[PDB]
Design a protein around this ligand. Structure first.
Ligand SMILES: Cc1cc2c(cc1C)N(C(=O)CCc1ccccc1)c1c([nH]c(=O)[nH]c1=O)N2C[C@H](O)[C@H](O)[C@H](O)COP(=O)(O)OP(=O)(O)OC[C@H]1O[C@@H](n2cnc3c(N)ncnc32)[C@H](O)[C@@H]1O
Length: 643
């Protein structure tokens, strides 16, 4: 299944047309189904040709010459399919050698705001389409939220660092194009408690099992019993989790109650039984006395005998139905149900798993939409997640090649009229001098964090619509930070990619809870997630680093941990060019807000466009999502201005 694989790698069903293809090829969709079969084959085959060699441009001509008969005879259809694929960035995207050098005459002018992955991806596309494009970037470097620290042989990512599975991932293509080294993340992640001692394999698995069950329960509660609203307020994942925990505690307490009652019932039956036995002893004494007096005794002794014995066919008979209780009793007082749902130490380990979830969503669980937080799960790529051994920055740096990028240029105003656009920016090195760039269209890749800024960092004239600002307000924008510790010696286990630090309290569960071992040099990356992320930004590097070494010394022993030669600490929330790490579906929002974020603003025809991780519903908060949003917008714009 080569062509079938190509469709999959392109996130398309290999045996049916998509709604997009239906719209652009209505004559094929509403026509002979045999022609559709031909369409899909041409499409899947063209993708395969591109994917088999993503370093060279795939021309219409080369596609035609490589298609087998009878396909290579339907010249017009092939061109229609090749043009569509190229326009929408499914082929000839990223970085590749052009065999068809760009035309000197550039049509249309578009200003891209932001030189991150989405802006860069869109820039390259628009340029290859022959448009005049200039990127305005506030920072003194490209990449935005993909940021790599490089000094000597030290390499460490302060922004994105993980690639999520290559099957269907556009980054699989870009990876090949820029020669970026990826390493699969080894699963083993040992956990250490606050005292530094390792958590036994048993408990680790037990608690992780509960975590999974707890999450599965919130999903049931949400997508079955429709428990998504309470007191007119939307329910958060954090909220639901604490409720499911309470129920577990209730159940445990109920089984404890029932058990104690079995004990008390058995204890009462015994006491009462012992009491009638004591009276039967007193009744037997009444006989082992009296019984022995006269001459008719040959009949009086017989009588007193078959009488005193019958009272033993009664007594030791009770001692029998007594041993069946002392047995039942001791059996119960030896097999008590769980005393608690989670021991104090168990709850701390569970909180480590919640912190891990707060890391992934870049936000405290109490802010996540119970119903939509995993809204995009159905789009995950297949395969092991990987890490970028040589620094993720190699991607935006390569994507910037040949582009007209203006660094240290912060945009402050965006004007858009029915007949043109004006973008006003200022030199960040001398806020005195401003710049005024005229253009036909503006592509805004500003982070959701900057769009939410109050007072606004950049002004829109006219101001953005209410349906856009409302969506910007509902959507969540998280935070996550890292501390880079550069040593001259490796004191950790080189075979382990990650290990966790279990915090003491629920509130600080995200503080330096996870350490990563990913590079050539002796470097460790520690994460600060959830509530701890924003708070820790208020601590100086020295103090935060010291707390790290304290954790590390507790695990590997002091004297084993030398002072770091180099350290880097990120503060994404305080970073004015980001104001956070990435978006998350907030309680009260939904995946639709991502679609609303993608919508262009048009007074008589589309003028203001949007790209970025926050504008792509099926791939939010990721580098590939940023990439795809950029490819998407370049297509929408070329369609408007080039036809
Ligand atoms: C901050 C951050 C972000 C990410 C991560 C860690 C951290 C600390 N990584 C993770 O820990 C996540 C892992 C993860 C695994 C699986 C799924 C999801 C996540 C991570 C991860 N994503 C991922 O796939 N794998 C990852 O490993 N992210 C998120 C991505 O970095 C992010 O979604 C993506 O880079 C967004 O790119 P965009 O182009 O949408 O935004 P940005 O790069 O910020 O570009 C905007 C530009 O605008 C510029 N700018 C601003 N204001 C102005 C102005 N006024 N004028 C002119 N220019 C301006 C600003 O400086 C930027 O250069």
């Amino acid at each position: 299944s080569g062509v079938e694989g190509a469709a999959f790698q392109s996130r398309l069903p290999h045996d049916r047309m998509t709604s997009q293809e239906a719209a652009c090829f209505p004559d094929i969709i509403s026509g002979p189904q045999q022609t559709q079969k031909v369409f899909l084959f041409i499409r899947n085959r063209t993708l395969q040709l591109w994917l088999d060699n993503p370093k060279i441009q795939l021309t219409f001509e080369a596609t035609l010459q490589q298609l087998e008969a009878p396909y290579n005879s339907d010249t017009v259809l092939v061109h229609r399919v090749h043009s569509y694929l190229e326009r929408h960035g499914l082929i000839n995207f990223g970085i590749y050698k052009r065999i068809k050098p760009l035309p000197t005459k550039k049509t249309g002018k578009v200003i891209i705001i932001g030189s991150g992955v989405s802006g860069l991806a869109a820039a390259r596309q628009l340029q290859s389409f022959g448009m005049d494009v200039t990127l305005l970037e506030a920072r003194d470097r490209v990449g935005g939220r993909v940021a790599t620290f490089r000094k000597g042989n030290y390499v460490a990512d302060l922004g994105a660092m993980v690639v999520t599975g290559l099957g269907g991932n556009p980054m699989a293509v870009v990876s090949k194009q820029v020669n970026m080294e990826l390493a699969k993340i080894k699963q083993k992640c040992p956990l250490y408690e606050a005292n530094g001692q390792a958590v036994p394999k048993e408990k680790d698995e037990m608690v992780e099992q509960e975590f999974n069950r707890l999450l599965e329960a919130t999903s049931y509660l949400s997508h079955q019993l429709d428990f998504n609203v309470l007191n007119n307020k939307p329910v958060s994942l954090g909220q639901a989790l604490e409720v499911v925990i309470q129920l577990q505690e209730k159940h445990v307490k109920d089984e404890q109650i029932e058990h104690w009652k079995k004990i008390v019932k058995t204890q009462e039956e015994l006491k009462e039984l012992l009491n009638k036995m004591v009276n039967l002893k007193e009744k037997i004494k009444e006989l082992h006395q009296q019984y022995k007096e006269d001459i008719t005794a040959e009949f009086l002794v017989k009588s007193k005998h078959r009488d005193l014995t019958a009272l033993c066919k009664e007594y030791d008979e009770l001692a029998e139905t007594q041993g069946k209780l002392e047995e039942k009793l001791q059996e119960l007082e030896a097999n008590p149900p769980s005393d608690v749902y989670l021991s104090s130490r168990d709850r701390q380990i569970l909180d480590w798993h919640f912190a891990n979830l707060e890391f992934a969503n870049a936000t405290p669980l109490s802010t996540l939409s119970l119903k939509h937080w995993d809204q995009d799960d159905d789009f995950e790529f297949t395969g092991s997640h990987l890490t970028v051994r040589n620094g993720y920055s190699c991607v935006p740096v390569a994507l910037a090649e040949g582009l007209d990028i203006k660094l240290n240029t912060a945009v402050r105003q965006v004007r858009y009229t029915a007949s043109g656009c004006e973008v006003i920016a200022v030199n960040t090195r001398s806020t005195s001098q401003t710049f005024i760039y005229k253009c036909d269209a503006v592509l805004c890749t500003l982070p959701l964090g900057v769009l939410k800024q109050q007072p606004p960092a950049v002004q829109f004239v006219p101001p953005l619509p209410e349906w856009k600002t409302s969506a910007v307000q509902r959507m969540g924008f998280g935070n996550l930070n890292k501390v880079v510790l550069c040593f001259d010696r490796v004191f950790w286990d080189p075979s382990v990619n990650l290990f966790g630090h279990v915090g003491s309290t629920t509130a600080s569960r995200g503080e330096l809870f996870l350490f990563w071992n990913l590079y050539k040099a002796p470097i460790l990356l520690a994460l600060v997630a959830g509530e701890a992320a924003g708070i820790m930004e208020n601590i100086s590097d020295d103090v935060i680093v010291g707390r790290c070494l304290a954790i590390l010394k507790g695990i590997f022993g002091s004297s084993a941990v030398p002072q770091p030669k180099e350290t880097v600490v990120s503060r994404w929330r305080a970073d004015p060019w980001a104001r956070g790490s990435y978006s998350y579906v907030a309680a009260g929002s939904s995946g639709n807000d991502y679609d609303l974020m993608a919508q262009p603003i048009t007074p008589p025809i589309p003028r203001l466009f949007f790209a970025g991780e926050h504008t792509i519903r099926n791939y939010p908060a990721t580098v590939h999502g940023a990439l795809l949003s950029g490819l998407r917008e370049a297509g929408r714009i070329a369609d408007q201005f080039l036809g």
